[PDB]
Structure formats: structure tokens, C-alpha cells
Amino acid sequence: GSMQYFAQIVNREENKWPSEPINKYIHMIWIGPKNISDKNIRLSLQTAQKNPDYSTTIIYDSGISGYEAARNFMSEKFKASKITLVDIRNKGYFHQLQQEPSFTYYEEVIRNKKFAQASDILRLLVLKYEGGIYKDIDDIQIKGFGSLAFPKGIGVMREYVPEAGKSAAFPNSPIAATKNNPVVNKTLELAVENYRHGEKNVLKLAGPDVFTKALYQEIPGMCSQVLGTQLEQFELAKRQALKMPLEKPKSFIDEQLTLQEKAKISRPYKAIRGLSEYVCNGADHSWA
Ligand SMILES: [Cl-]
């Protein structure tokens, strides 16, 4: 045979990480005394309707003064649906959450009434113990999830580019993850280090930029430049096995790596971005 070893390397990269199933829980958070908007109520109902095999819950907090007025508003609006409000205090692992370093900052942030900044922390704690899919009340459910399985047990959206930043960022919503996922844990570790270091920058706390940085440490290929570098290395490796000029191709027609070979190498990192065909992101936090 010829090129059978090179074709074996390409096939190894396609299934290097087996896809792990995701628990069928849709976690959504709405904490504070502000009432949920009419749009977010309709999107939440649409979320539960499009996922009858998922149990959809909206997580509120009873440790915030004035929470009853907003919680009473949600129950009357969701009493005839599959949306079941669950208090984070009444969780079956709340005593373990109190022993988490991030929960002290969660308590410290809700006291300052920075509810959106606190939601970035709680969503990772819920995915740590229970797992499943976190989604925000503003995220639009395009189609139902069904049985989802992701390489490394982690599913995210396509990364966006901040209009002034220099690095892309994966949104921290929606996030699909297995129970006690390494990417979720590393995001919590970086979040604790940022809060320990008094990071006044809201981006360098528990938001998408921190979730992205933790995703790159566990799965370095998620960085577009890293995967692109890996494709250029296979291009040179194929030329060496072909006994062709060991050089980077000048034009596209001179590339030896076929499109099918590029797709095989990129298969794991495409699947991790699989949540983009199920959910459309909302911009409620943008207007805030
Ligand atoms: Cl060979």
C-alpha cells in the first residue's frame, strides 16, 4: 500500500475523542426582583414545547430580598406549562455549593445586586453538579435538541468577535456539558482566580472571555488559528509522504490536502460547536 499510514492519521483525528451523551436538563436562570419580560416568557414556553423529552427549569434565588414579587409573577405565567421554578437554595446539593469557592463571590455579587454577573457563576455550578444544557431566557430555541452527544462532553456555540477586541469568544450560553465536565471546572477555577485578584473588568471574571480561555486550555484545537496550523502541518506531512516540494502551497489548486481530509481533521472541533443549529442567541444583555 501507499499513503495508508497518512490516511490512518487523518482517520485517527476524526474520532480522537468519543462523543459523550448529555443529560436531558435545560437549566435557565432568572434571579432578582425584576419581573421577567413578556418576550422571555414566550421564549421560555417555546423552549419547553420544542423539547418535550427535556425537563426545563427556571432557577431563581430566595436569598435576594424582594424575590417573591418576581417569583410570584413567574408562577402565574408558567403554572400551566412544563416550566417548573426551582429555588437554588432548595437544590439537593446546596450544602455542597456553600463549600464552593465561587459561591462566596456569588453571594458577594448578589449582595451588590449584580445579578447578571452572578448568573455567569451559577450556570457553571449547576452544570458541574447536574450537567445538561444551560440556556438563557433571551436565547431563541430554533429546533429541539433531541439526544445530544459531544466530543469531550462539551457543546458550545460558534464564537463571535467583539467589535473592539482582538480575540474571538465563545458565548457562555447556551452550554451543553456532561456532569462535572473539565471545561466547566477550569472555567470555575479561572473565575475564582479573577475574583481573588479583584478583577474590576467584567469581561475577565466569569463571562465568555473566561469560558473561552478555559476551553482553549482543555481543548487547544478550539482556537481557529491552532486548528488552521494543524491543517498546514498535515499539508506539509502529505507532501513529504508524496515526495513533493516541502513548501506551503501558494494557491489553492496546489494544496495536496483534499477537502475531505480537511473535514476529517476538523470533525471534532466542528461537532463541539453543534449547539448553533439548535439555538439563536439573544441580545438582552447587550441592551443592558
Ligand atoms: Cl503507507
Numbering used by the authors: 15 to 302
Tell me what the authors wrote about this structure, in their words.
In order to characterize the mechanism of operation of these proteins and to shed light onto their architecture, we initiated crystallization trials with different constructs. sYeGT was crystallized in the absence of ligands and in the presence of UDP-GlcNAc and manganese chloride. After accurate determination of twinning parameters, the phase problem of the ligand bound structure was solved by molecular replacement and refined to final R and Rfree values of 15.3 and 16.9, respectively. This structure was consequently used to support molecular replacement and model building of the ligand free structure, which was refined to final R and Rfree values of 20.4 and 24.5, respectively. The ligand-free structure features four molecules in the asymmetric unit. Superimposition of the ligand-free and ligand bound sYeGT structures showed no major conformational change upon nucleotide binding. Residues 257 to 267, which are resolved in the ligand-free structure only, form a loop that connects two helices of the 3-helix bundle. At the C terminus, the last resolved residues (294–301) are covering the empty nucleotide-binding site in the ligand free structure, while they are pointing outward in the UDP-bound sYeGT structure. In the ligand free structure, Asp-298 stabilizes the covering position of the C terminus over the unoccupied nucleotide binding side, as it forms a salt bridge with Lys-53, a residue located close to the uridine base binding site.
The respective glycosyltransferases are important virulence factors such as the Clostridioides difficile toxins A and B. Here, we describe two glycosyltransferases of Yersinia species that have a high sequence identity: YeGT from the zoonotic pathogen Yersinia enterocolitica and YkGT from the murine pathogen Yersinia kristensenii. We show that both modify Rho family proteins by attachment of GlcNAc at tyrosine residues (Tyr-34 in RhoA). sYeGT has a cone-shaped structure comprised of a globular domain with a Rossmann-like fold on top of a three-helix bundle. The catalytically active domain is the Rossmann-like fold domain, which features a 6-stranded antiparallel β-sheet flanked by 7 α-helices.
